[PDB]
Amino acid sequence: NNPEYSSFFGVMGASSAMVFSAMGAAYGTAKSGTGIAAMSVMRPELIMKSIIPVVMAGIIAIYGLVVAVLIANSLTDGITLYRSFLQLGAGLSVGLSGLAAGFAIGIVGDAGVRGTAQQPRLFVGMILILIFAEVLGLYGLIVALILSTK
Amino acid sequence: NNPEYSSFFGVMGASSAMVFSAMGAAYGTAKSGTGIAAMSVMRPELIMKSIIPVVMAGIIAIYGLVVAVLIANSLTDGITLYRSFLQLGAGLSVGLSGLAAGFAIGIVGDAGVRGTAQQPRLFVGMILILIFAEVLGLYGLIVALILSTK
Amino acid sequence: NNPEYSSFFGVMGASSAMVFSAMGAAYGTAKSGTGIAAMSVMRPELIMKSIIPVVMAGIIAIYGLVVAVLIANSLTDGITLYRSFLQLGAGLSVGLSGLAAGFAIGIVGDAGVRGTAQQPRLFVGMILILIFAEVLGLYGLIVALILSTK
Amino acid sequence: NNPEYSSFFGVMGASSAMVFSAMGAAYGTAKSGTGIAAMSVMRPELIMKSIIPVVMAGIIAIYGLVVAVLIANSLTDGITLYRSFLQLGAGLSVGLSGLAAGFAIGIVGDAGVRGTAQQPRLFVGMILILIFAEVLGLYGLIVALILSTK
Amino acid sequence: NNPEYSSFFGVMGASSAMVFSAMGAAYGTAKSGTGIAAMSVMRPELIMKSIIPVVMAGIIAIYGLVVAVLIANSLTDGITLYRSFLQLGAGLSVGLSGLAAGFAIGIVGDAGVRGTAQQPRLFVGMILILIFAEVLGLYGLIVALILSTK
Amino acid sequence: NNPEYSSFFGVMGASSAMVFSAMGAAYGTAKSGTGIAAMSVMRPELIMKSIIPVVMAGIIAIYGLVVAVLIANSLTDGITLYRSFLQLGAGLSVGLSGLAAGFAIGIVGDAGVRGTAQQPRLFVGMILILIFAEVLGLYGLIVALILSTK
Amino acid sequence: NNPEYSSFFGVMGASSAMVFSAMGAAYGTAKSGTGIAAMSVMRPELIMKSIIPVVMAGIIAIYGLVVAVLIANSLTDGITLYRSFLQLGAGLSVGLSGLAAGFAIGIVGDAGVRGTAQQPRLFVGMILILIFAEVLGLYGLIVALILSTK
Amino acid sequence: NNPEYSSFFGVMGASSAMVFSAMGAAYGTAKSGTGIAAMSVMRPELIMKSIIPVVMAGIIAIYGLVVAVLIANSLTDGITLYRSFLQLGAGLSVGLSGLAAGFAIGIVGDAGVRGTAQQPRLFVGMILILIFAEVLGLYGLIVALILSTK
Amino acid sequence: TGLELLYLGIFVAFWACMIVVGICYTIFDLGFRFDVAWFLTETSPFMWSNLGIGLAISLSVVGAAWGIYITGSSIIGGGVKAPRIKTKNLVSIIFCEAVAIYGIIMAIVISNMAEPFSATDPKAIGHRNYHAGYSMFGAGLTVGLSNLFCGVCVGIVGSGAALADAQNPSLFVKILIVEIFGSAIGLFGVIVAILQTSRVKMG
Amino acid sequence: RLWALSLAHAQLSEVLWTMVIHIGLHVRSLAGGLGLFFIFAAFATLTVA
Amino acid sequence: LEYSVVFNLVLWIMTGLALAVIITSYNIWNMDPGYDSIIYRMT
Amino acid sequence: SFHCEYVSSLSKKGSLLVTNVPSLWQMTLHNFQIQAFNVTGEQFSYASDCAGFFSPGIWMGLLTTLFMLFIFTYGLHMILSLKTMDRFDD
Amino acid sequence: LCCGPKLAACGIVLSAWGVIMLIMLGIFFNVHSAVLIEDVPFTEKDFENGPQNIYNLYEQVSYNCFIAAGLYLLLGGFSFCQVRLN
Amino acid sequence: SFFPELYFNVDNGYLEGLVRGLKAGVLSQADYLNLVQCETLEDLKLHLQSTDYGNFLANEASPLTVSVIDDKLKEKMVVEFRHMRNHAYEPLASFLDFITYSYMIDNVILLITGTLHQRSIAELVPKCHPLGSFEQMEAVNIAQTPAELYNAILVDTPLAAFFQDCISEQDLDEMNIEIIRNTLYKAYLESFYKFCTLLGGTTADAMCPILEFEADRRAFIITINSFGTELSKEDRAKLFPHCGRLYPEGLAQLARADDYEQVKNVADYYPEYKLLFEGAGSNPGDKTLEDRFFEHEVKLNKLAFLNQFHFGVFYAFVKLKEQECRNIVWIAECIAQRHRAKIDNYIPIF
């Protein structure tokens, strides 16, 4: 008795949970990669220490993947329109939260590695700021899991 | 009885809360991180203190998370369209008010840490301006609670 | 009798009253923050005295909060569509008026504090101009109250 | 039986899977290739090593091709609307994720190759960052396979 | 019987006739006043003779007022849709022609006042060009009057 | 029977015929006026000759007025939809043709005036160019006359 | 049978045939007039010989006029939608083709005259290039005649 | 049987096949004319050789003309929607291909016309790139003929 | 930002109107009017099929010509001082034109799939015909856009390769691999288009 | 232009009466005299301006 | 019954006219003021 | 309920009624409104109707015109962004 | 008290204008002149039995205008005194 | 990312290739080793004739002079740049004009110095650097009037916007010509940086570092040179361009600086400047900080060619070929004065 077009919203839930987390992580890896290279032309020994922002950006894509896999496993042909809306909400709330966290990680990582070449003391501050940025994707994940496992 | 598209506005309430509060917190964190990275070159000992703007940016994401979890817990299959509109209003309030708060905190923190590199007495003024910029997120949270628990 | 979509305009009035007012206050506080920080490099003693633009920006968010709480409390299930339109109008009248007042307060705060750094005689003039920028948000509040209570 | 228009969304799933993955691969190859060409005059011996970002960009097109072939093979004229949505979801979740991976790969390849031309030791760090950027395409592929084979 | 929404287009004719004429006059006054302000610093005694462009700009607002008042006094509840269209057409024909005349007056007045600062003989030609610019708003008024009284 | 909404296209034909001709004449007058003003600083003798571009621009406004008057005079409530479309076509054909003619007049008038200050021989060619730029308004007028009186 | 609104496309065909031809010719005249004004300062004797680009920019308007007059004389009241579409097609094929030809004439005329100021031998080449840019309007005229007389 | 409006799509095919080809050819002629004008002043004897890209732009225009004439002669009154959409397909096939080919001819012709002046050996290279840039319009014409004669 | 303001204003106004309209339809229970089924079903299959063919060829040519001028500008500029460029760096042009060749081949293949119906009630048109229309549109978009991006990419890489060759003759044969990798994307698009239209038959 | 300016002047005088001194005239209480004093100060200044 | 046709005619004609007015007014508004030959003294 | 101006067999009036075989009858129902299910007393329920914002023909036309407008805007962007040299060689 | 001569001159001119105009306005209201009906503060229930009910309010507004004129006369006297000091 | 690869080559592809062709001709390290070993200026001419320069010097008189060689090299650079400028389009044309403004800012100082010393401008024009020559005739027949020259500059020269830092012709008479030159250069450099950032894309990302280094070296060297002069700290601080990475608090600590050790302390906070200062021994017989800054500038310009679609390559080429002209002039000076011991001090390019 449910609409056959109900599953469209759940499909977009999974699609957003992956696409937007991937875009956020791509930006976080790209800005951080340009920063790491422009830093490494002068201070090669800081490469592996400065790879941290890239990893924290990748964790955003992992959040997106976990939520997208959860939504995908939750999809069915008879899924109620309510559940489909829940899954679209979870998908957006993880994907765009990860997008924001990825922008923050990208800018912070670029600036932080560039500075850490100039000021070694800045490393811990950069790491703390990056943890704060990552926690935004984590909050997106928590909301998405609540919605998708109602 | 109640319309099936009622839950859509509730899930947009939750996702809007989280997404927009996370974007505000991300902008604040990114601007504050750029500011800290620029300041730390001349004045390394200020990196730890200068993370206060990042903390008050993260608190905006915490507001958004709280409202999002309230809405997510309040969602149920047959919620009245009126209740769904209330949750949408709470989500928009908290999320976009926190977005504005994040914009203000980002600009204020960037400028304030850059100034505090030069004139240490600017720090107290920066903290007060940050508190003023941050209570905007708190007003968003108050309106969101009043709407969401109504 | 009343269409069941009647409360959408009430919730959007509340959310507008808060969101737009908070955006205005955030811009005001951001511009005043940049101005204050830039001035404070050379004139540190003015840091606290120069917080007034930020306060008059926060007052705008307080107008928004008052109107938004009024609408949120005055918003029942069977709200007449006419009264819901009244509340939407009140929300817009306070929110966008606060946005205008916040832009004016921000620009005047930046200009006035930067001038005060150079010419101490400008403080009273700046405060007068800020009061004139603030009475705009006050007019918005008055019209919003008239509409909400009508 | 199933609706007339159902296959439309599956067709668009295939089209997105290939178009967006081609966009990502094309951007990755073009950006990394202009970087490589500009580098080569300064450092002719590094070209065969610098090809790696180009191969990583091509792998995004391979992901897109795999998902698109799966969709085009499974997509019959009268598939159920639910499967059609699933295939659109897989198409987007591979195509736009691979677009993000392609952008990350292009930016990282350009910057890293230009840096490696100046500092050989950046090569391994560039490989790691490229792996983290390309794995986003793999996450898109995983979500796409799950959706399309569900 | 005539439709209920008929008065909308007549009311929009009135409001447009006033609004766009006011915009044209505002632009004309703004540019002409900037020209006078720049002219004064060097040639004080020309300040009064150089207010003429502001006056010719105000003519356009007066024309908008004439048409707006005429339409407003012609409005009725049972206004036929044909008369509503005539009033809308007249309102736009005066409002936007006055806007164009205001652009012409503003630009010609700014340039001409600045020039007359440097060469007094320009004044007559400047007046002639301003007359040619204002007769555009006059033509708009003529068209609006013919439409409205028809 | 003829539809009640038929007269909308006729009133827009008149309003367009006047509005766009007025915009073209305004551009032509404004740019030629700035050109005359700049020229007059050195060569005051040439103001009354160089005014000709402005006369050419004004003739476009007269074309617009004539077509608008024809349309407005031909309007009625029962105006058959065919005649209404004919009048809209006449209005556009003269309004936008006059717009283009006025833009050409403005550009060539400014260039020709400034050149004539430097080289008096340019005046006759400026007259020819203005005529070629202005007969575009005449062609638009001819087409509008045919369509409107048809 | 021949729906009441059928004439709209034919009337828009006439309006396009005139408006876009007029805009092409106006751009050609404007650009070539600027070129001629710049050239005439140093090489007065070339002005009358160099008006050819303006003539060929004008001829585009004669093409547009011919097609517009033919369409306007080929409009009955109950015109079949087929013929109304044919006349819209002729109008576009001539108007936009004339617009392209006018852009070509303008660019080529400006460059060619400002070059012929430097090198006399460029004149015949400029005439050939102007002929090639001109025959685009002629091709538009051919297609428009076929469509409009069909 | 067939819908009244079926001829619109074939008409748009003809008008597009002419308009877009004219725009491509106009861009090609304008760019090549700028190149030739710049080239002539230093090396006068190359004008007639360098006029070749203009010839190829004219050829693009002729491709457009052939397709447009074919469609126009094919447009009957009772044209089935199938034939009409075939002709729309041909119209786009020739128009957009000719647009892109004209752009390529323009750019490569500008570059090569300039280059031949400094390095005469580049003449054959320019011609060889241009024939490849023009066989693209030829390809579009082939597909357009096949579609419009299907 | 002149023309980009017009573009952005149109885009933002359109999508604000879409958000408001979607909210209004959903809220007023008028969702039953927003028949995407009716749209996709009444919009004739011929429209989708012929848009597919037209784009299949035209976007491929917009790719080929785009890459051709991107790389030809560099070929000519570098050839001013290094004339050896002209003969060797023509391979980039060949790779850009192969994209338009994919375009024509697939446009002809897709146009071979169109047939008349003589049926206008959607039940009579049927799943097979609607699928034929949508799949030809999908093949057109796939091949056309994949080829557009592939041509632009190969053009960029070919320009880079020509400039590199300007300064070291031995460099070309090694940068050509990047152009090959870029060119493979057009082949992938062609494969996907073929598979999309593998089981299509209008009638 | 004569009529245009005449209408502008007439309507501006009408508004400046009916929303300044009409305020003090259309009040029930006898303090309306002092209200008129102040409102008339405002009326005079605005009319002159 | 003609609602589709009249709605689209009005909507798209008015969109075209509005865009034309906005673009023309933008060009006039941001017209090069021409007194740049005077500016350098005033600045 | 369903409302529709002119549910009639005449081509001049929408031809909502139709026959494949020629017939002797013709019919016209100006402002035809009907409701046969979920009826409530003497009142028609809210009214759906044929008169919509868009129709199939208008949709086909609008989408074809949108594609053509994208192509024309691309071409016009390229043509407008043409430029001419400001200087010439000696 | 003291004030600038220009302020005092403005005060006396304003007082003269106010006195003349408001005396005339009070006269015209006490006359029950029709052209000033819209400014009378009457209510919709005052139209029942005859014009007297509204004549009374006309008188009231006339008294208000006379009071305002008296205030302006006192202001004029004070401004004349100020001018004399200056 | 601004995707310049899509639309750069539409208008700037030909010159993009041509300028790189020109760069391919700048002398290599091996070419400099060839020039180093010449016995005479004629021998230098012959060894140079095999390079891109070819027979540029063959038309001059038999007794070659290093002044003549310098003039010919400058003439060649000017010819090439003027060709590119004549073939440039609006945005690239504006960028090239910004490059020329730098030389205009020195020619204008020549003009004002001549005018305040009451000399005919016709005698000054020949001494102007051709890249920034005043074509405008408003700057001719000045009658030796500073007000006339100042109005001519404001009304008919691009430097009108830069002179707005000054306000009056009286400033020309009062301020030292070096302060005028450096204030104009600060204004020009900041305007150039803003222009490059507004261009954005690869142009910004590849050019802004060069101008930032220009600002930082300006700050360092102005500070180091100002010690033994009347120039006050308060006026010195105005000369620092605010684009460089020193801008907040670095320029401030320099304005507060009163010794070379304090300038070096400011430099210590930046790794890319710490290295230059440590390497610049500055004692007699070895590299000075000027030499180290020239080397770093050459490195920065060389890096501009690693990016493809951007204007920065034209600026990099102009400065690199200027460095190459100065290198050849230096080698000629060493050959003429027989100061072979220090002939290696040329800055190698590529």
Across the interface, do K34 and E103 touch by the CB < 8 Å criterion? no
Q: Which residues contact N15 (CB under 8 A, 6 or more apart)?
A: I77, N84, N87, N88, N92, N314
Sort H49 into a burial class: Cβ within 10 Å, 0-12 / 13-18 / 19+.
middle
Is the separation of the CB atoms in C41 and B115 below 8 Å? yes
Q: Which residues contact A76 (CB under 8 A, 6 or more apart)?
A: A7, D82
Chains G, H in contact, 3 or more Cβ pairs below 8 Å: yes
Identify the domain containing residue D106 by its residue range: 1-150
Is the separation of the CB atoms in L88 and L42 below 8 Å? no
Six-digit token string for I13: 């106004």
Maximum Cα–Cα distance for chain N, whole Å? 56
- Rounded distance between C-alpha atoms, residue N319 and residue N323, angstroms: 6
**Pick from D29, D41, D73: CB nearest I168:** D41
Is the separation of the CB atoms in H40 and H117 below 8 Å? no
Six-digit token string for N246: 């020193």
Across the interface, do I177 and D51 touch by the CB < 8 Å criterion? yes
Is the separation of the CB atoms in G8 and F3 below 8 Å? no
b/e string for I16-41 if b means 16 or more Cβ within 10 A? eeeeeeebeebbeeeeeeeeebbebb
E131 close to K (CB below 8 A): no
In Å, what is the CA distance from B139 to each residue of B96, B103, C136, N235, N321? 11, 15, 20, 49, 62
- Rounded distance between C-alpha atoms, residue A38 and residue A55, angstroms: 18
Nearest to D16 by CA among D62, D57, D67, D56: D67
- Rounded distance between C-alpha atoms, residue A110 and residue A33, angstroms: 8
β L2-4/L28-29 pair status: unpaired
Six-digit token string for G124: 């015949």
Place of tokens 């369509």: F147
| Tally of CB atoms within 10 A around C23 | 27
- Rounded distance between C-alpha atoms, residue H36 and residue H44, angstroms: 10
- Rounded distance between C-alpha atoms, residue N214 and residue N148, angstroms: 33
M8 close to J (CB below 8 A): no
Place of tokens 């590529």: N350
In Å, what is the CA distance from N315 to each residue of D34, F128, N85, N98, N320? 20, 45, 12, 10, 8
H114 close to N (CB below 8 A): yes
Place of tokens 């006490």: M30
In the three-class reduction of DSSP (H, G, I as helix; E, B as strand; rest coil), residue F67 is classed as: helix
Give the start-end residues of each E strand in F51-99. Answer: none
Is the separation of the CB atoms in D125 and A47 below 8 Å? yes
Place of tokens 């600038």: M4
> In the complex, which subunits touch B with 3 or more CB pairs below 8 angstroms?
A, C, I, N
Residues forming a β-bridge with L48: L2
Give the start-end residues of each E strand in I22-64. Answer: none
DSSP N232-252: -HHHHHHHS-TTSTTTTTHHH
Strand (E) or helix (H) holding L28: strand L28-29
Place of tokens 């003739």: F59
If you measure CA to CA, which chain A residue comes closest to D101? A26
Is the sign of the CA dihedral J10, J16, J19, J25 positive or negative?
negative
In the three-class reduction of DSSP (H, G, I as helix; E, B as strand; rest coil), residue L4 is classed as: strand
| Tally of CB atoms within 10 A around N177 | 13
Six-digit token string for D61: 């097109």
- Rounded distance between C-alpha atoms, residue N88 and residue N100, angstroms: 14
Q: How many CB pairs under 8 A join G and L?
A: 19
Six-digit token string for A138: 């984590």
| Tally of CB atoms within 10 A around A25 | 37
Place of tokens 């008042």: E69
> In the complex, which subunits touch J with 3 or more CB pairs below 8 angstroms?
E, M
- Rounded distance between C-alpha atoms, residue H3 and residue H7, angstroms: 9
Torsion of CA C120, C122, C127, C128, to 10 degrees: 150
Is the separation of the CB atoms in D144 and D90 below 8 Å? yes
Nearest to E98 by CA among E26, E29, E30, E21: E21
In Å, what is the CA distance from E33 to each residue of E99, E107, K25, N153? 17, 11, 20, 28
- Rounded distance between C-alpha atoms, residue I166 and residue N17, angstroms: 8
Strand (E) or helix (H) holding B126: helix B122-148
Written as one letter, the residue type at A47 is: I
N contact residues 293-312, partner I, Cβ 8 Å cutoff = 308
Nearest to B15 by CA among A66, A67, A61: A67
Sort I123 into a burial class: Cβ within 10 Å, 0-12 / 13-18 / 19+.
exposed
**Pick from I66, I156, I167: CB nearest N20:** I167
Is the sign of the CA dihedral I49, I50, I51, I53 positive or negative?
positive
- Rounded distance between C-alpha atoms, residue E20 and residue E94, angstroms: 8
Nearest to K12 by CA among C47, L58, G43: L58
- Rounded distance between C-alpha atoms, residue M1 and residue M20, angstroms: 26
Written as one letter, the residue type at F19 is: V
Six-digit token string for G79: 């015109």
Across the interface, do B38 and N248 touch by the CB < 8 Å criterion? yes
Please give the DSSP secondary-structure letter assigned to residue N128: S
Query: How many residues does the structure list for chain B?
Result: 150
- Write the Ramachandran bin of D16: left for phi over 0, alpha for psi from -120 to 50, otherwise beta: alpha
**Pick from G1, G110, G117: CB nearest L84:** G110
Across the interface, do J7 and E63 touch by the CB < 8 Å criterion? no
Six-digit token string for C112: 């006035």
J28 close to M (CB below 8 A): yes
Taking any CB pair shorter than 8 Å as contact, residues of chain L touching chain I are 48, 52, 56, 59-60, 63-64, 67, 73, 77, 80
Residues forming a β-bridge with L7: L29
- Rounded distance between C-alpha atoms, residue K13 and residue C113, angstroms: 50
Which chain I positions have a beta carbon within 8 Å of B3's beta carbon?
A: 29
Please give the DSSP secondary-structure letter assigned to residue N258: -
- Rounded distance between C-alpha atoms, residue I77 and residue N202, angstroms: 20
| Tally of CB atoms within 10 A around J38 | 12
Half-sphere exposure of E132 (CA within 13 A, CB side): 28
β L32-34/L2-4 pair status: antiparallel
Nearest to A17 by CA among A111, A135, A140: A140
- Rounded distance between C-alpha atoms, residue J17 and residue E4, angstroms: 35
Please give the DSSP secondary-structure letter assigned to residue J19: I
Is the separation of the CB atoms in E37 and E53 below 8 Å? no
In the three-class reduction of DSSP (H, G, I as helix; E, B as strand; rest coil), residue A146 is classed as: helix
Strand (E) or helix (H) holding G39: helix G7-40
b/e string for N93-127 if b means 16 or more Cβ within 10 A? bebbebbbbbbbbbbbbbbbebbeeeeebeebbee
Is the separation of the CB atoms in E90 and E143 below 8 Å? yes
Please give the DSSP secondary-structure letter assigned to residue N259: S
Q: How far apart are the first and last CA of chain B?
A: 21
Half-sphere exposure of A86 (CA within 13 A, CB side): 24
If you measure CA to CA, which chain C residue comes closest to B95? C19
- Rounded distance between C-alpha atoms, residue B40 and residue A120, angstroms: 10
Q: Which residues contact E105 (CB under 8 A, 6 or more apart)?
A: E24, E28, E32, E53, E56, E57, E60, E130, E133, E134
Secondary structure (H, E, C), I113-146: CCCCCCCCCHHHHHHHHHHHHHHHHHHHHHHHHH
- Rounded distance between C-alpha atoms, residue C104 and residue B44, angstroms: 37
The C-alpha angle N298, N300, N303, rounded to 5 degrees, equals 110
Q: Which residues contact D4 (CB under 8 A, 6 or more apart)?
A: I37, I40, I41, I122, I123, I125, I126, I127, I130
Is the separation of the CB atoms in M4 and M83 below 8 Å? no
Rg of chain I on CA atoms, in Å: 22
- Rounded distance between C-alpha atoms, residue G98 and residue F100, angstroms: 13
Six-digit token string for H89: 């397909």
> In the complex, which subunits touch F with 3 or more CB pairs below 8 angstroms?
E, G, K
In the three-class reduction of DSSP (H, G, I as helix; E, B as strand; rest coil), residue D75 is classed as: coil
Q: How many CB pairs under 8 A join G and K?
A: 7
Alpha carbon B119 to chain centroid, angstroms: 28
What's the structural domain count of chain B?
Answer: 1
| Tally of CB atoms within 10 A around I168 | 13
Q: Which residues contact H81 (CB under 8 A, 6 or more apart)?
A: H2, H3, H6, H9, I44, I46
- Rounded distance between C-alpha atoms, residue B112 and residue B110, angstroms: 5
- Rounded distance between C-alpha atoms, residue G60 and residue F97, angstroms: 13
| Tally of CB atoms within 10 A around N338 | 7
Six-digit token string for B77: 């299959």
I54 close to N (CB below 8 A): no
At G45, phi and psi to the nearest 5?
A: -65, -20
At M4, phi and psi to the nearest 5?
A: -65, 145
Q: Which residues contact I176 (CB under 8 A, 6 or more apart)?
A: I91, I161
Strand (E) or helix (H) holding N53: none
Residues forming a β-bridge with L40: L43
Rg of chain D on CA atoms, in Å: 18
Across the interface, do I47 and L77 touch by the CB < 8 Å criterion? no
In Å, what is the CA distance from H61 to each residue of B54, E146, H16, H23, I65? 61, 47, 12, 8, 16
Q: Which residues contact I87 (CB under 8 A, 6 or more apart)?
A: H125
Nearest to K4 by CA among M74, L56, D109, F120: L56
| Tally of CB atoms within 10 A around G91 | 32
Written as one letter, the residue type at G12 is: M
Is the separation of the CB atoms in E112 and E126 below 8 Å? yes
β L48-49/L2-4 pair status: parallel
Secondary structure (H, E, C), L33-81: EECCCCCECCECCCCEECCCCCCHHHHHHHHHHHHHHHHHHHHHHHHHC
| Tally of CB atoms within 10 A around N143 | 9
Is the separation of the CB atoms in H91 and H67 below 8 Å? yes
Nearest to D11 by CA among A10, I195, A11: I195
The alpha-carbon gap from H49 to the nearest alpha carbon of chain I, in Å, equals 17
In the three-class reduction of DSSP (H, G, I as helix; E, B as strand; rest coil), residue L29 is classed as: strand
DSSP G88-132: HHHHHHHHHHHHHHHHHHHHHHHHHHHHHTT-TTHHHHHHHHHHH
